Structures are given as C-alpha cells and as structure tokens.
Amino acid sequence: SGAIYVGNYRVVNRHLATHNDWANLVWEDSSRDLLVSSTTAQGCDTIARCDCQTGVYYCSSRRKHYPVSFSKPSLIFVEASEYYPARYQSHLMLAVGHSEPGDCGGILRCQHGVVGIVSTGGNGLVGFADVRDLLWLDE
Ligand SMILES: NC(=O)[C@H]1CCC(=O)N(Cc2csc3ccccc23)C1
Ligand SMILES: [Zn+2]
C-alpha cells in the first residue's frame, strides 16, 4: 500500500483505489495503473520534474529503502494478476530489486522529489509507475 499527497490530490495505484477515491475521482488510467482523487487537506510531497534514472524506493516487504538504477518510462508487457489480464502497461520503469504484490504504493524518489510508485514486479525485478509527466499535479 501507499500514496502520494501533493496539493489537493492523492495519487494511488488504480488497483488499490478505495470507494472514497472513486467517489472523488480526478483522473484514472488503467494502462498506467494510476488513479488520482481529490483531498480536503493540503499535501506536501514534492514531485520530481527530471529525467533521473537513479533513486531510492521503499520496500514494505523488507521494511527497508533500497537505492536503484531504473529504465526510462516505457510500454512494458505485464503478466496477468487478479486485477488485470496480461497487457502492456505504459509509463513504466523497471529496476533490479525485491518486490512482492503488497509492496505496490511504495515511493521511488530522486534528489528532485517523488518519481513514482511501485506497480509491478517479479523474478528479482521491481516496476514503478512514473508520475513526473503529470504536470497538473502542481497546479
Ligand atoms: N498490473 C499491475 O500493475 C499490478 C496489478 C496487481 C498485482 O498484483 N501485480 C503483480 C505484482 C505487482 S508488484 C509484484 C511483485 C512480485 C510479483 C508480482 C507483483 C501487477
Ligand atoms: Zn530527479
């Protein structure tokens, strides 16, 4: 689990969105596994605006943060799960690192701020849904 809180927005994995997230929907994209809902409280996270390929992510299944090198956002084939059939997920970045399904939502950060959230994984890889291109999260 995990979310990004910026301004009057809450960014979560679309497959983990709650009833309140859907009742206050701002934007969702199944191909990216992202959903953004509105909040009454003001969020303080900073979103990165950059093309970094190194950062640190939080891994809840180890209670640890790990430093990683990751690929630029791209269209990657993702195996079926209980939430989606096998499909291409867009805006996805991969790294070599540990992840389990419950790790989804953990933040990946660089020196500029929040880069994205854990969304995919398996076989010693971890994939992150990018949020750096969502310029509207700031205004
Ligand atoms: N299509 C998606 O974005 C998600 C939907 C929900 C889901 O359980 N997964 C699989 C998954 C995510 S982290 C991880 C780590 C080790 C094994 C499996 C997984 C994919
Ligand atoms: Zn950066």
mmCIF file of C-alpha atoms and ligand atoms in Angstrom:
data_model
loop_
_atom_site.group_PDB
_atom_site.id
_atom_site.type_symbol
_atom_site.label_atom_id
_atom_site.label_comp_id
_atom_site.label_asym_id
_atom_site.label_seq_id
_atom_site.Cartn_x
_atom_site.Cartn_y
_atom_site.Cartn_z
ATOM 1 C CA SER A 1 0.000 0.000 0.000
ATOM 2 C CA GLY A 2 0.959 3.679 -0.266
ATOM 3 C CA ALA A 3 0.017 7.036 -1.807
ATOM 4 C CA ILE A 4 1.481 10.444 -2.912
ATOM 5 C CA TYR A 5 -0.088 13.552 -1.382
ATOM 6 C CA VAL A 6 0.538 16.766 -3.416
ATOM 7 C CA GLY A 7 -1.648 19.871 -3.230
ATOM 8 C CA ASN A 8 -5.321 18.813 -3.184
ATOM 9 C CA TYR A 9 -4.513 15.422 -4.867
ATOM 10 C CA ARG A 10 -3.945 11.827 -3.685
ATOM 11 C CA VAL A 11 -2.101 9.529 -6.175
ATOM 12 C CA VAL A 12 -2.618 5.741 -5.651
ATOM 13 C CA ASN A 13 -2.246 2.500 -7.643
ATOM 14 C CA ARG A 14 -5.565 2.274 -9.601
ATOM 15 C CA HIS A 15 -5.952 -1.428 -8.469
ATOM 16 C CA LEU A 16 -5.821 -0.353 -4.790
ATOM 17 C CA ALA A 17 -8.152 2.698 -5.101
ATOM 18 C CA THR A 18 -10.892 2.829 -2.415
ATOM 19 C CA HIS A 19 -14.645 3.742 -2.684
ATOM 20 C CA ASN A 20 -13.768 7.323 -1.481
ATOM 21 C CA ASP A 21 -11.044 7.570 -4.184
ATOM 22 C CA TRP A 22 -13.638 6.641 -6.873
ATOM 23 C CA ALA A 23 -16.299 8.995 -5.371
ATOM 24 C CA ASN A 24 -13.730 11.924 -5.580
ATOM 25 C CA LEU A 25 -12.135 10.851 -8.912
ATOM 26 C CA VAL A 26 -9.959 13.449 -10.778
ATOM 27 C CA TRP A 27 -8.213 11.168 -13.342
ATOM 28 C CA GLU A 28 -7.531 7.417 -13.828
ATOM 29 C CA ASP A 29 -5.673 5.408 -16.461
ATOM 30 C CA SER A 30 -5.913 1.584 -16.435
ATOM 31 C CA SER A 31 -2.954 1.306 -18.879
ATOM 32 C CA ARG A 32 -0.762 3.107 -16.289
ATOM 33 C CA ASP A 33 -2.250 1.507 -13.083
ATOM 34 C CA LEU A 34 -2.786 5.108 -11.722
ATOM 35 C CA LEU A 35 -5.716 6.874 -10.103
ATOM 36 C CA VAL A 36 -5.823 10.425 -8.697
ATOM 37 C CA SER A 37 -8.524 11.541 -6.247
ATOM 38 C CA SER A 38 -9.153 14.918 -4.583
ATOM 39 C CA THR A 39 -8.470 15.700 -0.874
ATOM 40 C CA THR A 40 -9.707 18.383 1.531
ATOM 41 C CA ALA A 41 -6.303 18.515 3.348
ATOM 42 C CA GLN A 42 -3.236 20.085 1.671
ATOM 43 C CA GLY A 43 -0.491 17.622 0.649
ATOM 44 C CA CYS A 44 3.242 18.424 0.983
ATOM 45 C CA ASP A 45 5.115 15.887 -1.201
ATOM 46 C CA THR A 46 7.269 17.323 -3.996
ATOM 47 C CA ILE A 47 7.028 15.785 -7.485
ATOM 48 C CA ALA A 48 10.306 15.407 -9.418
ATOM 49 C CA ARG A 49 10.471 17.147 -12.843
ATOM 50 C CA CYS A 50 13.563 15.495 -14.392
ATOM 51 C CA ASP A 51 14.944 12.508 -16.348
ATOM 52 C CA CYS A 52 16.867 10.859 -13.417
ATOM 53 C CA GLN A 53 17.496 7.119 -13.756
ATOM 54 C CA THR A 54 18.783 6.627 -10.138
ATOM 55 C CA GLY A 55 16.774 6.883 -6.929
ATOM 56 C CA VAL A 56 15.671 5.169 -3.710
ATOM 57 C CA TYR A 57 12.464 3.145 -3.174
ATOM 58 C CA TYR A 58 10.610 1.978 -0.097
ATOM 59 C CA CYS A 59 10.092 -1.857 0.069
ATOM 60 C CA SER A 60 7.437 -2.707 2.695
ATOM 61 C CA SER A 61 8.151 -6.494 2.466
ATOM 62 C CA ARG A 62 11.672 -5.772 3.826
ATOM 63 C CA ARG A 63 10.890 -2.572 5.924
ATOM 64 C CA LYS A 64 13.857 -1.028 4.002
ATOM 65 C CA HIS A 65 14.714 1.553 1.410
ATOM 66 C CA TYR A 66 16.921 0.467 -1.482
ATOM 67 C CA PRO A 67 18.973 2.523 -3.977
ATOM 68 C CA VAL A 68 18.308 1.539 -7.654
ATOM 69 C CA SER A 69 19.074 2.338 -11.279
ATOM 70 C CA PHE A 70 15.839 2.302 -13.345
ATOM 71 C CA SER A 71 14.848 2.439 -17.010
ATOM 72 C CA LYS A 72 13.099 5.498 -18.601
ATOM 73 C CA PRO A 73 9.244 5.271 -18.697
ATOM 74 C CA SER A 74 8.126 2.863 -21.418
ATOM 75 C CA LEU A 75 5.441 0.344 -22.610
ATOM 76 C CA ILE A 76 6.213 -2.981 -20.951
ATOM 77 C CA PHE A 77 4.356 -6.350 -21.082
ATOM 78 C CA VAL A 78 2.946 -7.209 -17.602
ATOM 79 C CA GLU A 79 1.717 -10.746 -16.711
ATOM 80 C CA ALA A 80 -1.903 -11.270 -15.623
ATOM 81 C CA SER A 81 -2.895 -10.800 -11.958
ATOM 82 C CA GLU A 82 -6.327 -10.829 -10.201
ATOM 83 C CA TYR A 83 -6.702 -7.088 -11.185
ATOM 84 C CA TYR A 84 -5.772 -7.072 -14.897
ATOM 85 C CA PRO A 85 -5.429 -9.570 -17.764
ATOM 86 C CA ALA A 86 -1.890 -9.770 -19.351
ATOM 87 C CA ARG A 87 -1.335 -6.418 -21.119
ATOM 88 C CA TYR A 88 1.146 -3.664 -21.962
ATOM 89 C CA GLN A 89 1.406 -1.151 -19.074
ATOM 90 C CA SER A 90 2.570 2.329 -20.210
ATOM 91 C CA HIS A 91 4.846 4.846 -18.425
ATOM 92 C CA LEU A 92 6.538 2.002 -16.507
ATOM 93 C CA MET A 93 10.159 1.970 -15.256
ATOM 94 C CA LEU A 94 11.989 -1.228 -14.255
ATOM 95 C CA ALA A 95 14.846 -1.842 -11.804
ATOM 96 C CA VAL A 96 16.606 -4.899 -10.358
ATOM 97 C CA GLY A 97 15.327 -5.224 -6.813
ATOM 98 C CA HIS A 98 12.989 -7.039 -4.484
ATOM 99 C CA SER A 99 9.219 -6.608 -4.596
ATOM 100 C CA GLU A 100 6.017 -8.544 -3.662
ATOM 101 C CA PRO A 101 2.415 -7.514 -4.663
ATOM 102 C CA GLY A 102 1.800 -5.788 -1.301
ATOM 103 C CA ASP A 103 4.781 -3.518 -1.997
ATOM 104 C CA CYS A 104 2.615 -1.565 -4.531
ATOM 105 C CA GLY A 105 2.368 2.083 -3.481
ATOM 106 C CA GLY A 106 5.928 2.377 -2.111
ATOM 107 C CA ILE A 107 7.539 5.627 -3.286
ATOM 108 C CA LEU A 108 10.578 5.907 -5.619
ATOM 109 C CA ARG A 109 12.391 9.229 -5.014
ATOM 110 C CA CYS A 110 15.400 11.019 -6.574
ATOM 111 C CA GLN A 111 17.205 14.228 -5.420
ATOM 112 C CA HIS A 112 14.386 16.252 -7.165
ATOM 113 C CA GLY A 113 11.452 14.582 -5.397
ATOM 114 C CA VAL A 114 8.868 11.805 -5.973
ATOM 115 C CA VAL A 115 9.411 9.915 -9.249
ATOM 116 C CA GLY A 116 6.660 7.275 -8.993
ATOM 117 C CA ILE A 117 5.180 4.331 -7.077
ATOM 118 C CA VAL A 118 5.749 0.542 -7.086
ATOM 119 C CA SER A 119 3.249 -1.028 -9.528
ATOM 120 C CA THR A 120 4.733 -4.305 -10.934
ATOM 121 C CA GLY A 121 7.378 -6.921 -10.152
ATOM 122 C CA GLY A 122 8.571 -10.495 -10.037
ATOM 123 C CA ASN A 123 11.699 -12.531 -10.859
ATOM 124 C CA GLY A 124 14.004 -10.058 -8.995
ATOM 125 C CA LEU A 125 12.647 -7.008 -10.788
ATOM 126 C CA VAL A 126 10.529 -4.118 -9.464
ATOM 127 C CA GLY A 127 8.482 -1.758 -11.695
ATOM 128 C CA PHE A 128 7.400 1.783 -10.914
ATOM 129 C CA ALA A 129 4.529 3.791 -12.410
ATOM 130 C CA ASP A 130 6.004 7.226 -13.380
ATOM 131 C CA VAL A 131 4.240 10.438 -12.223
ATOM 132 C CA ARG A 132 6.856 13.035 -13.433
ATOM 133 C CA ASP A 133 4.953 13.793 -16.647
ATOM 134 C CA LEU A 134 1.709 14.736 -14.727
ATOM 135 C CA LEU A 135 2.475 18.456 -14.631
ATOM 136 C CA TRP A 136 -1.049 19.311 -13.479
ATOM 137 C CA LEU A 137 -0.439 17.679 -10.047
ATOM 138 C CA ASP A 138 1.255 21.030 -9.071
ATOM 139 C CA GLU A 139 -1.473 23.467 -10.165
HETATM 140 N N1 LIG B 1 -0.576 -4.791 -13.355
HETATM 141 C C1 LIG B 1 -0.144 -4.169 -12.266
HETATM 142 O O1 LIG B 1 0.348 -3.027 -12.287
HETATM 143 C C2 LIG B 1 -0.181 -4.981 -10.980
HETATM 144 C C3 LIG B 1 -1.612 -5.341 -10.567
HETATM 145 C C4 LIG B 1 -1.588 -6.016 -9.192
HETATM 146 C C5 LIG B 1 -0.514 -7.064 -8.996
HETATM 147 O O2 LIG B 1 -0.600 -7.869 -8.070
HETATM 148 N N2 LIG B 1 0.506 -7.089 -9.881
HETATM 149 C C6 LIG B 1 1.565 -8.063 -9.716
HETATM 150 C C7 LIG B 1 2.739 -7.592 -8.892
HETATM 151 C C8 LIG B 1 2.889 -6.291 -8.517
HETATM 152 S S1 LIG B 1 4.325 -5.997 -7.605
HETATM 153 C C9 LIG B 1 4.789 -7.664 -7.717
HETATM 154 C C10 LIG B 1 5.939 -8.252 -7.194
HETATM 155 C C11 LIG B 1 6.134 -9.614 -7.349
HETATM 156 C C12 LIG B 1 5.200 -10.382 -8.003
HETATM 157 C C13 LIG B 1 4.062 -9.802 -8.534
HETATM 158 C C14 LIG B 1 3.828 -8.421 -8.421
HETATM 159 C C15 LIG B 1 0.638 -6.271 -11.095
HETATM 160 ZN ZN ZN B 2 15.475 13.593 -10.486
#
